Write a protein that binds this ligand. Structure first.
Ligand SMILES: COc1ccc2cc(C(=O)/C=C(\O)C(=O)O)ccc2c1
Ligand SMILES: [Mg+2]
Ligand SMILES: [Mg+2]
Length: 710
């Protein structure tokens, strides 16, 4: 056995060596004490971890049996609520309180802006994400459909000046609405200068200053013909680049080359739903990337240095060139044979992630041969928790890891995903359980939709997938999340965050509708690319999030009844063509994701749906699709033959979109491990714990790896 014995643990050699040779050096942590602590923590906390998972199962069975023993319809919310209280699912709401989290960076406590999520196993994506703190607006407008590709303005192989003018004019309007001139418009500016520490913009027939001179933040170059002008609005920086001999500047009335936005303020390096990591070799690749990110030396293309500026008065100052980094550990469910005990049982992956990503994170608190958290914190997102006891356990785990790492208590801060029903309905108690550690709450609406379907599996058939985004339960869930955060003092102390935009090509749609999120008081929301970060940043220049949160203080906009409104489909409701479309749509989504998961170990993939729209699919959207079909199969909406036919229908189409080093599924379907994984996720969906996809995915990916080795 390629394994190392430490107490009761047998550690995969590749992981043991990585930690000893790469992660421990520079921490001043004694290697023997670390591994002894690994062993101690795993032995102490595994039972409670397991008890919690059994409790999920106890609760789900009592709820299953509750729906089964009643034909009365539609519902007796009074009865259902009393039952949830009786069985300990719905707990008493504690008294009001204010969080006490301290030692947090300004990007979290203060700044409102985009938050980018990226798979940590892909080093190149992770580098671009960390560098996405600044992004070119002209590139993002020219490259996407925010400037429509109408007649004459489409993208070709070389610069289309008609299109670029549209981009320039779009950016002038943005500047006008964000940093207004005293009189006149940026559209007519001819140049910029600094005089007596003030920004002076030259118009055709006069000159003007800023309506708020305080929005002038700095410049580069000679004051009397600068190379760039730096502005701030709503805590976010805008940089106007001036270069008339550049390609775009030659055509511009003021020589303006580009407009740079402070874009992804923070970034979440993901070990969970956007990655596939089923053994020690996978986790080591992830850990190694997370290590180079914190040491500053990851290269695939390198990390950016900080940005240098001249203050208005004349001094020098610096701005961060990198996004402040979070890490998303896996949650409490899965184990991983990267470590096994003497009976051969796998160790809980979440316990491992806290020990190892926390150890690695120490490097980001010290100088890189230039830092992540200047205030001494480690920022871990914790997903897929169910209720305050599960939150308390995470807090205890962090305490024990801090002790093993020699770290001050409460160094390891937690971003609470609100993406499971038992957390939503006890949200205040969950925040209280982490009152000294919590740095955000975030509505992970995709996982939350999966948990909604699974929890009420037995109640009846659910509405279609596309219908879910506007059901009553989800809008109350969204508002109740903001209310609980604001009520716990998150304003000025912690982030209130919302959901991912998954239509990577529908960027005009994103600019037009994602504005709802800061309008609802969210200080941050999730984007999947640096491009999307730059464009989403526009919404924080239009909406004053701090003032919005102020106006919501004390309001109570969601009742417990509304939260508990199950998304049951009404009588009739669907025609045959609509039932067929939803089945086809779900099967292709599942197939396209799973085939790259199982075969190539890619945890996030662009997959076109039945309407040919490109969706960024990850494990959460997979949880929704499989659970929805499982629920339809369970209540007689469709038959097992419909599932099989739809899967066999869509598989050749997926094979075409991948034709790469790719193994087709058709025509020998039952010989493709990926195809059988898709089938299994639907047919066993109702039996997976809380509808989770990781058991089946991890098993099938390991099965595939084993075949590829003989
Ligand atoms: C590179 O493209 C990506 C990367 C990461 C992603 C992460 C999520 C996600 O995790 C959503 C939630 O947690 C929740 O709704 O439950 C969704 C789409 C993603 C797409
Ligand atoms: Mg999620
Ligand atoms: Mg304003």
């Amino acid at each position: 056995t390629d394994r190392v014995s430490v107490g009761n643990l047998r550690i995969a050699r590749v992981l043991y060596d990585f930690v000893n040779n790469e992660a421990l050096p520079g921490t001043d942590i004694d290697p023997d004490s670390f591994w002894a602590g690994v062993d101690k923590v795993v032995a102490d906390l595994t039972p409670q971890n397991q008890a919690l998972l059994n409790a999920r199962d106890e609760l789900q069975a009592q709820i299953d049996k509750w729906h089964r023993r009643r034909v009365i319809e539609p519902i007796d919310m009074d009865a259902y609520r009393q039952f949830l209280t009786e069985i300990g699912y719905l707990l008493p709401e504690p008294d009001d309180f204010t969080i006490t989290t301290s030692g947090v960076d300004a990007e979290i406590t203060t700044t409102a802006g985009p938050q980018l999520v990226v798979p940590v196993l892909n080093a190149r994506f992770a580098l671009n994400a960390a560098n996405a703190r600044w992004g070119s607006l002209y590139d993002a407008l020219y490259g996407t459909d925010v400037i429509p590709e109408t007649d004459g303005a489409e993208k070709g192989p070389t610069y289309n000046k008609v299109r670029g003018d549209k981009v320039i004019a779009y950016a002038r309007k943005f500047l006008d609405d964000s940093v207004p001139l005293s009189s006149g418009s940026f559209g007519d500016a001819t140049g910029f200068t600094v005089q007596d520490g003030q920004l002076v913009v030259a118009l055709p027939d006069k000159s003007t200053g800023l309506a708020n001179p305080g929005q002038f933040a700095g410049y580069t170059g000679a004051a009397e013909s600068p190379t760039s002008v730096l502005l701030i609005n709503h805590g976010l920086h805008i940089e106007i680049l001036i270069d008339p001999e550049s390609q775009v500047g030659t055509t511009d009335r003021a020589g303006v080359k580009d407009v740079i936005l402070e874009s992804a303020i923070t970034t979440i390096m993901d070990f969970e739903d956007s990655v596939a990591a089923v053994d020690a070799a996978d986790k080591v690749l992830g850990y190694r990337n997370w290590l180079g990110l914190n040491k500053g030396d990851l290269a695939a293309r390198v990390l950016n240095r900080d940005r240098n500026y001249t203050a208005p008065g004349g001094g020098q100052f610096t701005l961060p060139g990198r996004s402040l980094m979070f890490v998303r550990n896996v949650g409490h469910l899965m184990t991983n044979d990267a470590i096994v005990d003497t009976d051969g049982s796998e160790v809980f992956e979440g316990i491992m992630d806290a020990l190892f990503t926390g150890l690695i994170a120490i490097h980001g608190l010290k100088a890189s041969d230039l830092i992540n958290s200047r205030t001494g914190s480690i920022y871990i997102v914790k997903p897929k928790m169910h209720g305050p006891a599960e939150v308390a356990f995470t807090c205890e785990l962090f305490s024990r890891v801090e002790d093993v790492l020699g770290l001050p208590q409460n160094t390891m801060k937690i971003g609470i995903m609100d993406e499971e029903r038992r957390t939503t309905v006890n949200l205040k108690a969950c925040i209280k359980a982490a009152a000294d550690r919590v740095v955000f709450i975030n509505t992970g609406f995709l996982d939350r939709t999966g948990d909604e379907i699974h929890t009420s599996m037995e109640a009846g058939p659910m509405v279609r997938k596309g219908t879910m985004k506007s059901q009553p339960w989800i809008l109350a869930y969204e508002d109740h999340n903001v209310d609980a955060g604001l009520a716990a003092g998150f304003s000025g102390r912690a982030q209130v965050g919302k959901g991912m935009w998954t239509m990577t090509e529908l960027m005009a749609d994103m600019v037009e509708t994602k504005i709802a999120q800061p309008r609802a008081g969210a200080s941050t929301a999730w984007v999947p690319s640096p491009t999307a970060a730059t464009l989403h940043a526009l919404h924080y220049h239009q909406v004053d999030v701090a003032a919005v949160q102020q106006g919501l203080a004390g309001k109570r906009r969601a009742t417990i009844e509304q939260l508990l409104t199950i998304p049951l489909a009404k009588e009739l409701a669907w025609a045959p063509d609509e039932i067929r479309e939803e089945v086809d749509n779900n099967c292709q989504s599942i197939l396209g994701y799973v085939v790259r998961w199982v075969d190539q170990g890619v945890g996030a993939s662009k997959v076109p749906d039945i309407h040919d729209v490109a969706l960024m699919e990850d494990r959460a959207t997979l949880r929704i699709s499989s659970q929805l079909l499982a629920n339809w199969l369970r209540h007689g909406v469709i038959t097992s033959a419909d599932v099989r036919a739809s899967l066999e229908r869509m598989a050749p189409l997926v094979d075409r979109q991948n034709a790469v080093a790719y193994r087709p599924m058709a025509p020998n379907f039952d010989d493709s491990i990926a195809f059988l994984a898709a089938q299994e996720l639907i047919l066993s969906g109702a039996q997976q714990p809380n509808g989770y996809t990781e058991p089946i995915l991890h098993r099938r990916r390991r099965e595939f790896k084993a075949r590829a080795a003989e």
